[PDB]
Amino acid sequence: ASFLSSIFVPVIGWVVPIATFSFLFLYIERE
Amino acid sequence: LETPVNASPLVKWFINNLPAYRPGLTPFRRGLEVGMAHGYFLFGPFAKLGPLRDAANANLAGLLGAIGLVVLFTLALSLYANSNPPTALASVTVPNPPDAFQSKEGWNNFASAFLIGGIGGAVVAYFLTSNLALIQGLVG
Amino acid sequence: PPYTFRTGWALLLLAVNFLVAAYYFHIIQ
Amino acid sequence: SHTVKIYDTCIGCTQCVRACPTDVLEMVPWDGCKAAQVASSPRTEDCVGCKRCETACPTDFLSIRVYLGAETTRSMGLAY
Amino acid sequence: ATKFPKFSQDLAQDPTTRRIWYAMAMGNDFESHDGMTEENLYQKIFATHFGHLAIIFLWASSLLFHVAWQGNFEQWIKDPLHVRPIAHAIWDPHFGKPAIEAFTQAGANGPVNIAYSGVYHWWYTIGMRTNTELYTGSVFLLLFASLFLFAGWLHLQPKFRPSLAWFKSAESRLNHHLAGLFGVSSLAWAGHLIHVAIPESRGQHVGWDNFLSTAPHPAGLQPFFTGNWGVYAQNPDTAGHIFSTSQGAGTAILTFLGGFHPQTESLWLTDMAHHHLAIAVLFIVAGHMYRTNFGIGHSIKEMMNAKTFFGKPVEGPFNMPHQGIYDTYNNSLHFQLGWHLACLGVVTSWVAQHMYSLPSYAFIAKDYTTQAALYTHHQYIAIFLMVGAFAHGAIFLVRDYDPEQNKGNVLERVLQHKEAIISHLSWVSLFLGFHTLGLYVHNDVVVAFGTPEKQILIEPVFAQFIQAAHGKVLYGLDTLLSNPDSVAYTAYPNYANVWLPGWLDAINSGTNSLFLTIGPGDFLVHHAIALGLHTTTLILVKGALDARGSKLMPDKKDFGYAFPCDGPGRGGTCDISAWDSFYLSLFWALNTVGWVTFYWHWKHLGIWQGNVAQFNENSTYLMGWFRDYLWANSAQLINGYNPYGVNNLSVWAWMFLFGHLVWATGFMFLISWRGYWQELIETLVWAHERTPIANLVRWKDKPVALSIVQARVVGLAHFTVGYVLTYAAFLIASTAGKF
Amino acid sequence: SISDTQVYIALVVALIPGLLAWRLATELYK
Numbered sequence A: 001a002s003f004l005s006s007i008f009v010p011v012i013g014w015v016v017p018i019a020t021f022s023f024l025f026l027y028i029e030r031e
Numbered sequence B: 001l002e003t004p005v006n007a008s009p010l011v012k013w014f015i016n017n018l019p020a021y022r023p024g025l026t027p028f029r030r031g032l033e034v035g036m037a038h039g040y041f042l043f044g045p046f047a048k049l050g051p052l053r054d055a056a057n058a059n060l061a062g063l064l065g066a067i068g069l070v071v072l073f074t075l076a077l078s079l080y081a082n083s084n085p086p087t088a089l090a091s092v093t094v095p096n097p098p099d100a101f102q103s104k105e106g107w108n109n110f111a112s113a114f115l116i117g118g119i120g121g122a123v124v125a126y127f128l129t130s131n132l133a134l135i136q137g138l139v140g
Numbered sequence C: 001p002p003y004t005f006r007t008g009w010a011l012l013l014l015a016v017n018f019l020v021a022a023y024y025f026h027i028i029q
Numbered sequence D: 001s002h003t004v005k006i007y008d009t010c011i012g013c014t015q016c017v018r019a020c021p022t023d024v025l026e027m028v029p030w031d032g033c034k035a036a037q038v039a040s041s042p043r044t045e046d047c048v049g050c051k052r053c054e055t056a057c058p059t060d061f062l063s064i065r066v067y068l069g070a071e072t073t074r075s076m077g078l079a080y
Numbered sequence E: 001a002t003k004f005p006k007f008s009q010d011l012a013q014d015p016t017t018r019r020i021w022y023a024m025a026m027g028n029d030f031e032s033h034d035g036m037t038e039e040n041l042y043q044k045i046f047a048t049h050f051g052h053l054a055i056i057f058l059w060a061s062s063l064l065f066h067v068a069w070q071g072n073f074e075q076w077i078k079d080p081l082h083v084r085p086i087a088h089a090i091w092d093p094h095f096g097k098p099a100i101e102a103f104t105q106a107g108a109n110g111p112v113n114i115a116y117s118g119v120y121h122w123w124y125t126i127g128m129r130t131n132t133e134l135y136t137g138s139v140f141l142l143l144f145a146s147l148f149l150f151a152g153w154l155h156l157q158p159k160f161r162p163s164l165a166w167f168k169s170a171e172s173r174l175n176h177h178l179a180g181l182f183g184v185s186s187l188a189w190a191g192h193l194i195h196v197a198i199p200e201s202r203g204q205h206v207g208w209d210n211f212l213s214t215a216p217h218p219a220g221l222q223p224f225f226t227g228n229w230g231v232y233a234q235n236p237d238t239a240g241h242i243f244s245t246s247q248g249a250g251t252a253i254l255t256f257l258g259g260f261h262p263q264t265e266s267l268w269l270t271d272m273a274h275h276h277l278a279i280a281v282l283f284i285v286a287g288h289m290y291r292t293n294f295g296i297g298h299s300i301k302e303m304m305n306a307k308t309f310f311g312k313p314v315e316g317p318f319n320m321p322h323q324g325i326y327d328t329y330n331n332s333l334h335f336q337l338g339w340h341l342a343c344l345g346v347v348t349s350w351v352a353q354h355m356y357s358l359p360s361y362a363f364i365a366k367d368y369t370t371q372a373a374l375y376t377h378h379q380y381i382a383i384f385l386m387v388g389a390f391a392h393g394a395i396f397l398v399r400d401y402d403p404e405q406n407k408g409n410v411l412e413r414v415l416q417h418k419e420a421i422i423s424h425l426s427w428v429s430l431f432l433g434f435h436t437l438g439l440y441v442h443n444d445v446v447v448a449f450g451t452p453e454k455q456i457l458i459e460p461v462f463a464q465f466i467q468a469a470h471g472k473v474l475y476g477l478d479t480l481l482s483n484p485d486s487v488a489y490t491a492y493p494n495y496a497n498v499w500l501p502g503w504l505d506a507i508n509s510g511t512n513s514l515f516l517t518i519g520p521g522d523f524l525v526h527h528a529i530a531l532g533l534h535t536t537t538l539i540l541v542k543g544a545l546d547a548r549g550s551k552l553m554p555d556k557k558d559f560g561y562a563f564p565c566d567g568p569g570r571g572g573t574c575d576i577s578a579w580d581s582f583y584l585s586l587f588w589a590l591n592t593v594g595w596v597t598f599y600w601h602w603k604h605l606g607i608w609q610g611n612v613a614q615f616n617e618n619s620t621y622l623m624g625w626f627r628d629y630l631w632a633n634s635a636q637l638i639n640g641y642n643p644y645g646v647n648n649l650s651v652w653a654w655m656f657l658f659g660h661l662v663w664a665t666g667f668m669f670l671i672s673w674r675g676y677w678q679e680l681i682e683t684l685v686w687a688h689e690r691t692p693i694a695n696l697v698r699w700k701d702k703p704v705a706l707s708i709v710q711a712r713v714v715g716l717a718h719f720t721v722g723y724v725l726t727y728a729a730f731l732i733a734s735t736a737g738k739f
Numbered sequence F: 001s002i003s004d005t006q007v008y009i010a011l012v013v014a015l016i017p018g019l020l021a022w023r024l025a026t027e028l029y030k
């Protein structure tokens, strides 16, 4: 099942930092 | 009096967490864990010590014996229930009864869940001892 | 004062320094 | 802001008041020293942590001391 | 005016971008948080310690799973001496087609990374044979790491949350951790070797299914209880034992040959079994020493405060005042953390010193690059653990230290004569450096002038002796286990040197790293190492002892541990704080471990290639280091990619250049300091409010330059990462390109 | 190597520490 690399690596490469940075930027800039 | 056996906090924490005494439980829930526990080990001395313990149906000799004696206990629970039982005691390690063991209605709920759990505890012990080489291939 | 407890252990350790050199100089074998 | 502690060892030299560029320091009368005045810091929300006031003090060791604390806009020295 | 960071109101009221950066470097500092009390501190550190513990098991499970699913472990069993291991596989979309063909290696379908961490040798030694045991141990560590993630959550709930007196019960940790964590676990691993790993070493499969049926010994635990323990040391694995087969096998489970297995050139598994069994008995006995609630045992607070040696009044133990040290170790957490990093830092290098000379893993002495990486790894780990020992020891003296509780004791007497410690440390650093650099430059000029016989070459005659006092005939000193007439050789009253015939076979062969032959090139580098240890200690001790103030600046304790300076006054005070003496030392600590690992690597490149004469001639003068090691070995590396093509070294050729760039970037934060850059950002703030379309958007946090203490962190971070990655790309590919 | 089935068991079992790590890291405060 070597096709899981095609679906975990782009999520951790792209989706994981986009979801993390967009959470943290809205959390540090929160009155 | 008071000793490090009846009152050490390791033992007070233990006895107050058995399902006979754990706070906030339906009496069906109390007899469910008491039943599954006592139905699990009582598969033991019938299967490997019984009269047909060398035959190919050795574990089935232990299953019908252990189920058939959970049914005997469940009668004795319902015999103790229907006899207008006296209120339970309060020792130095357990300061209060679990409040479901003074009504006739509460022992009847305790009696049924022993039967539901005691049969299921014996079946899973029949499942695990007949499938030893199954588990040790799922492990190695 | 003549430091007895200090010099007592320094002469013990220096006696270990001289003992190992006796093996290295073949004085003791 | 920062924290400006002034101990009781100074002589009223008025070198620290004439060196703090945001004018935090001022002289108040005080019957202790020979010049009969001690430095005081009543406006420490304006202090920028420059430590020009510690450089100009004669006494050994320093009678004035700047403790660097939480940095707001006035103490960062930001024109924006 | 935001609510981030939660742990500080002084940082959360910062309008600049300093708010963002100081949240990161004060986040795990639990002691400086807002409103943090004493018992809330320990209860939060204890549950955090379940968090770091469960990272370790989740880390070690990915080593098992990525090998079982993507590596060639079952193909590596058949021939471990030529089959080249596999760590994981590459899914890189940015690869070109000649860079998929170059990394399709070791007999695999796709691009794979050759494992240079040696975990196939450790798993093959301890009995694991197929890819299913690797997967089973992987899934077990998923559950075993979740058992600690639940435990840290459980011990933060209010009636499951431990009290303060539970943490400061120090005599009960020492009984449970020595007997249980050290002793039972050494006993359990001896049970794992004897039941499983030693029978797996003889071609005899023992798994979870049949370990209750099969016995490790045909005698079978009857000679244990009767006292006939010599039955366990019957016929061992012979000198023709082919590993993991039944040829030349034995029945013994606890044996004491000493030396190495003749094929794998590792330690005998029967020797390790009697080792961890004997370690286990020495620790369970050691764990029944200190006083707990059972009214028996030694009491450490009474051992410190004792003043009477058999009626004679003394100042304390060894007539030295150790009173109040129990209330100094146990009350402070930085004294504990500063202490135990020194303890863990000693053993970490001590691991590395004994794993190249005494290999304990099957076929690891012949897989070279896995052995060159494991030495250099645990040496650099030992570097940071020793620098942080003095670092967290110096946070103790600023923050936690109390001179009244510690009055008159041995830790007070060090702070009195601290100018005598730093002076004689400054002497040895200069006494070595003036005369070690002097003899390299002497040998450099002398060889350059074509007359190399005028070199000053010193035989290391004090370490020549120790190797001959351990049994090396090669020098002819004829003492002490090399003298066969010696009292130490024969063990005169009892003659019980069982280890000694197997030890002298190992030390007298020229086919291992056991007590390598040393010469005049090894004289100068051990005195160059001693230059690096006494000088790194000089910076760290002087920053520890002067952490509470001195002549140029008294009351440095009022300013905390990390503050920039005290201004340009008094001549200026740049890098005056106790943090700044942590800072200067990590240049030396990375330097010194360079010297100990340039010298490790180049002595073994002569052993592995059969050319011992290249090192012994050329390591006396500093061109031979520069030419025959740095220049000559980086030819396979730098040709990892050229205009002709690529090969499998092109990552290490790319990481080598990457390391030279991160290293050089860190100079920018150190040569140039802050006030240049705040006057540069104030022109970018101007030209953003004036640009007509781009001033629709605007910052929430005002841009300021990095603070003075911050870009010494950021400067040291680019320096250290680039120092590691440069050598780690040179260490691997110069060894894995030559074998 | 290991079978294609066994990889999915390892992923589902890995949600059990993934859930518990989210519980611990939020019990340690925000």
Ligand code: CLA
Residues within 6 Å of the ligand: A003, A004, A005, A006, A008, A009, A012, E055, E058, E059, E061, E062, E063, E065, E066, E088, E089, E090, E091, F007, F010, F011, F014
């Ligand atoms: C921390 C441990 C760790 C690390 C660094 C890696 C590293 C890698 N894995 Mg792997 N993996 C691990 C544990 C680990 N694995 C475990 C336990 C499992 C079983 C569930 C897997 C299952 C797995 C699969 C199925 C695949 C990878 C793949 C990969 C590669 C690409 C990264 C990726 O997509 O992640 C994938 C990540 C996951 C599937 C889930 C992560 C599971 C661990 C337990 C999370 C650890 C989080 C960490 C502790 C949080 C701390 C962050 C830190 C910065 C503070 C890379 C070699 C891919 C690959 O080989 O591409 C070629 C791929 O297809 N991994």
Ligand code: CLA
Residues within 6 Å of the ligand: E045, E046, E049, E050, E053, E166, E167, E169, E172, E173, E176, E177, E179, E180, E181, E182, E185
């Ligand atoms: C017998 C009972 C027992 C046991 C097993 C433990 C075990 C542990 N306690 Mg502990 N504890 C106990 C009783 C016990 N405690 C009691 C009674 C108290 C109260 C008085 C405490 C109070 C306490 C506190 C307050 C803390 C612990 C912590 C820990 C953990 C230490 C960190 C760790 O995992 O290192 C594991 C270390 C080893 C397995 C030994 C390593 C030996 C050296 C360093 C290396 C030797 C290995 C060798 C070279 C070979 C390795 C090679 C191989 C890896 C390839 C560990 C799980 C800490 C922790 O992390 O909390 C979770 C912590 O903060 N304990």
Ligand code: CLA
Residues within 6 Å of the ligand: E024, E025, E026, E027, E028, E029, E030, E337, E341, E384, E385, E387, E388, E389, E391, E392, E395, E561, E562, E579, E582, E717, E721
């Ligand atoms: C188990 C050991 C241990 C423990 C528990 C601690 C715990 C602590 N230390 Mg300590 N320390 C340690 C080891 C340890 N340290 C070691 C080994 C050293 C020597 C290097 C130090 C040096 C040290 C100093 C000098 C200081 C501390 C401080 C602290 C406290 C706060 C930490 C903090 O703010 O984190 C914040 C974390 C960071 C800022 C992390 C940034 C650094 C990361 C690791 C860089 C990584 C680079 C990058 C990811 C690489 C990518 C590569 C890629 C490009 C290819 C805390 C009590 C500080 C304090 O004030 O104490 C109260 C403090 O001043 N420690």
Ligand code: CLA
Residues within 6 Å of the ligand: E427, E430, E431, E432, E434, E435
């Ligand atoms: C042949 C070339 C050569 C050269 C160029 C040097 C050059 C140097 N040596 Mg060196 N040395 C050499 C050979 C050489 N050495 C040899 C063969 C020996 C073995 C005996 C030594 C032993 C030696 C010692 C023991 C010391 C030096 C020191 C020095 C430095 C200052 C010397 C001086 O006069 O300062 C001017 C002199 C003074 C400022 C005060 C006098 C200090 C003298 C050197 C010590 C004598 C005091 C006492 C009698 C002995 C002290 C006990 C000692 C045995 C441990 C200087 C760089 C010193 C050093 O490294 O300081 C950092 C130092 O302490 N050297």
Ligand SMILES: CC1=C(/C=C/C(C)=C/C=C/C(C)=C/C=C/C=C(C)/C=C/C=C(C)/C=C/C2=C(C)CCCC2(C)C)C(C)(C)CCC1
Residues within 6 Å of the ligand: B036, B037, B038, B040, B041, B116, B117, B119, B120, B121, B123, B124
């Ligand atoms: C060791 C020890 C101990 C312990 C002991 C005991 C107590 C044991 C027991 C054990 C047991 C005795 C167990 C049991 C278990 C059980 C189980 C595990 C079961 C399961 C079951 C199931 C799962 C079932 C289910 C079901 C039902 C319920 C119904 C329907 C059907 C079915 C089947 C589904 C003590 C602490 C004292 C002390 C120390 C040591």
Ligand SMILES: CC1=C(/C=C/C(C)=C/C=C/C(C)=C/C=C/C=C(C)/C=C/C=C(C)/C=C/C2=C(C)CCCC2(C)C)C(C)(C)CCC1
Residues within 6 Å of the ligand: E335, E338, E339, E342, E343, E346, E389, E390, E393, E394, E396, E397, E541, E544
């Ligand atoms: C050879 C040999 C031997 C011997 C050995 C020995 C004797 C060893 C030694 C060892 C040692 C001798 C070690 C040591 C080490 C040390 C160190 C490592 C230190 C460190 C420290 C620290 C770091 C500290 C810290 C601190 C500070 C800084 C401040 C205050 C606080 C504190 C204290 C914490 C024997 C006989 C056995 C056998 C044979 C061989």
Ligand code: SF4
Residues within 6 Å of the ligand: D006, D009, D010, D011, D012, D013, D014, D015, D016, D017, D037, D038, D039, D056, D057, D058, D059, D063, D064
């Ligand atoms: S603090 Fe310094 S400048 Fe101010 S009065 Fe005292 S001595 Fe003068």
Ligand code: SF4
Residues within 6 Å of the ligand: D002, D004, D019, D020, D021, D022, D023, D024, D025, D046, D047, D048, D049, D050, D051, D052, D053, D054, D066
């Ligand atoms: S912070 Fe120092 S330099 Fe600045 S105004 Fe105050 S006393 Fe003067």
